Amino acid sequence: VKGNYVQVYVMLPLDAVSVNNRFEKGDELRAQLRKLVEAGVDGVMVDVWWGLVEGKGPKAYDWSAYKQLFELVQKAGLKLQAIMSFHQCGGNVGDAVNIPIPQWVRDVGTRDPDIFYTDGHGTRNIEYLTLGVDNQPLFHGRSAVQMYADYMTSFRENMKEFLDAGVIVDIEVGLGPAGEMRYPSYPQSHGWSFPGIGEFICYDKYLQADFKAAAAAVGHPEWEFPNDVGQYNDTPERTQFFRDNGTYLSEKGRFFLAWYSNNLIKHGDRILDEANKVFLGYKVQLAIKISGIHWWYKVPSHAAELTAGYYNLHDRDGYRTIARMLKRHRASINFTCAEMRDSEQSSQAMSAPEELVQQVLSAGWREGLNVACENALPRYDPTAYNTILRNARPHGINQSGPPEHKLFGFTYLRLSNQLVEGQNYVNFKTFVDRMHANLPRDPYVDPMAPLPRSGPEISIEMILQAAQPKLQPFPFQEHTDLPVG
Ligand SMILES: OC[C@H]1NC[C@H](O)[C@@H](O)[C@@H]1O[C@H]1O[C@H](CO)[C@@H](O)[C@H](O)[C@@H]1O
Ligand SMILES: [Cl-]
Structure with a gap:
């Protein structure tokens, strides 16, 4: 039965450390984490905000608040997933917690605005640095990749005690806005609202130069970005690029889509190579x-x-x-939407979160990766938890041994007083029992080996062999066999 156990982590508040980089929630979090421990929770997840830690200047890392937070987590007996959060928290009208990237980095942007992902109207998104400057030494002598590597190295050195004690068990490497490996193609601040198609955010001069070179390397120097793509809030059929049988299918469209998606893949590969080197052993x-x-x-x-x-x-x-x-890299995938049913989504959005989740989990498992998931949106109801349970063990319980497929972990968004009071807490605690296959909490489950060095670099052509033939996902049960109620 133990091979069925799925770990449950809980995301801490966005302001677990204050926006002035002070630890102020000692008493509150102590009581809240005690409730999590009483509920069987294996660990917590936390944003380690770049804007807080390296906020005063290059290499002026102030870890003092995070250390106090981490001691609290260790004192509670919980495991810890640390996000290298190289992105802005909040920044939209109405957001409660606002933590930009370091001011001194934004100061570079006042002279070189092309450090930011830029749309076709020229709007600069300040939440994250363009992958176009990963290897450009624009930041008081350092590249973006060097800044990320140096931050992770400082983290390791300063938190060594927590690493050695097995408190920190997971490093989530932020690779874009909201920490996600993506472009900022649907920004509320630029006027996007759900379910607009979004936009291609490749207009910074660095990425423009990259495209031109890539285009010349295949014999087509003349080519430009597609201009029949509409705008953020369009639907596909309103554009010549995205409509059925549209120009996304052309030789040109295919080249552009490949170039754009490949650049994201290369960004992840090169940053993960550095992170692996940092955390080796x-x-x-x-x-x-x-x-x-x-x-x-x-x-x-x-x-x-x-x-x-x-x-x-x-x-x-x-x-x-x-x-x-x-x-x-032996890196894991952390996906989202684990809580969603297709029936819960708007019809005109043409939305299929269940099939998407099935696609991503199946892709990870076919590559031999650990896969974990988060809920996309806040949920406290048994239906949500039953959906997560289904995704956690897609073929149900194996009474004989471990199941054919399971999630390596699930991380719940997010801790507040609401979660640890009333019927919410009862529902949440019962969820954790079920995730644990009704066994008691086991702190020693899923032990990690010393991180080995990344294997040999493979080319983009090698990576892309995985695109086709496209396989059906593994079959998923419609409903969990171990529901909450
Ligand atoms: O965890 C990443 C995002 N997943 C999809 C959710 O809808 C979204 O809210 C999540 O982003 C938030 O939480 C992150 C972890 O706290 C944080 O890094 C990010 O900036 C968002 O606040
Ligand atoms: Cl295959």
């Missing part, structure tokens, strides 16, 4: 986060996935390519 898993772009999954162009950078079509597996890139 520590008993931790490295993970990336893939965003759950479920809208337009039911139309041929998969338009919102394409603009996010996931080149996914009925005959092209745009997630298995990503999974193949992760293999050499």
Whole structure:
């Protein structure tokens, strides 16, 4: 029965550490984490905000608040998943917690605005640095990749005690906005609202130069980005690019989609190679986060996935390519939407979160990866938990041994007083029991080996062999066999 146990983590509040980099929630979190422990929770997840830690200047890392937070977590006896959060928290009208990337990095942007992902109207998105500057030494002598590597190295050195004590068990490497490996193709601040197709965010001068060179390398120097793609809030059929039998299918469209999605893959590969080197020999898993772009999954162009950078079509597996890139690093996939049913979604959005989840989990498992999941949106109801349970053990319980497939972990978004009071807590606690296959909490489950060095670098052509033939997912049971109620 023990092979069925799925670990449950809970995300901490976005302001677990204050926006001024002070630890202020000692008493509150102590009581809240005690409730989590009483409920059987294996660990917590937390954003380690770049804007807080390296906020005062290059290499001025102030870890003092995170250390206090981490001691609290260790004192509670909980495991810890640390997100290298190289992205802005909040920043939209109405957001409660607002933590931009370091001011001194934004200061570079006042002179070189092309450090930011840029749309076709020229709007600069300040939430994250363009993958176009990964290897450009623009930041007081450092490249973006060097800044990420140096931050992770400082983290390791300063948190060594927590790593050695087995408190920190997972490093989630932020690779884009919201920590997700994607482009910022659906920004509320630029006027997007659900379920707009989004936009291609490749207009910064660095990416423009990259495209031109890539185009010349295949004999077509003349080529430009597609200009029949509409705008953020369009539907696919309103554009010549994304409509059925549209220009996304052309030789030109295919080249562009490949270039855009490949650049995201290369960004992840090169940052994971550095992260692996940093954490070599520590008993931790490295993970990336893939965003759950479920809208337009039911139309041929998969338009919102394409603009996010996931080149996914009925005959092209745009997630298995990503999974193949992760293999050499022994990195895990952290996906979302684990809580969603298709019946809960708007019809006109053409949304299929269940099939998308099935596609991403199946891709990870076919590449031999650990796969974990999060809920996309806040949920406290038994139906949500039953959906997560279904995704956690897609073929149900194996009474003989471990199941054919299971999630390596699930991380719940997110801790607050609401979760640990009233009927919410009862529902949550029962969820954790079921995730644990009704066994008691086992802190020693899923032990990590010392992280080995990433295997040999493989080319983009090698990675892309995973795109086709596109396979049906593994069959998933309609309903969990171990529901909450
Ligand atoms: O965890 C990543 C995102 N998954 C999909 C959710 O809808 C979204 O809200 C999540 O992003 C938030 O939480 C992250 C972890 O706390 C944080 O890094 C990110 O900035 C968002 O606040
Ligand atoms: Cl295969």
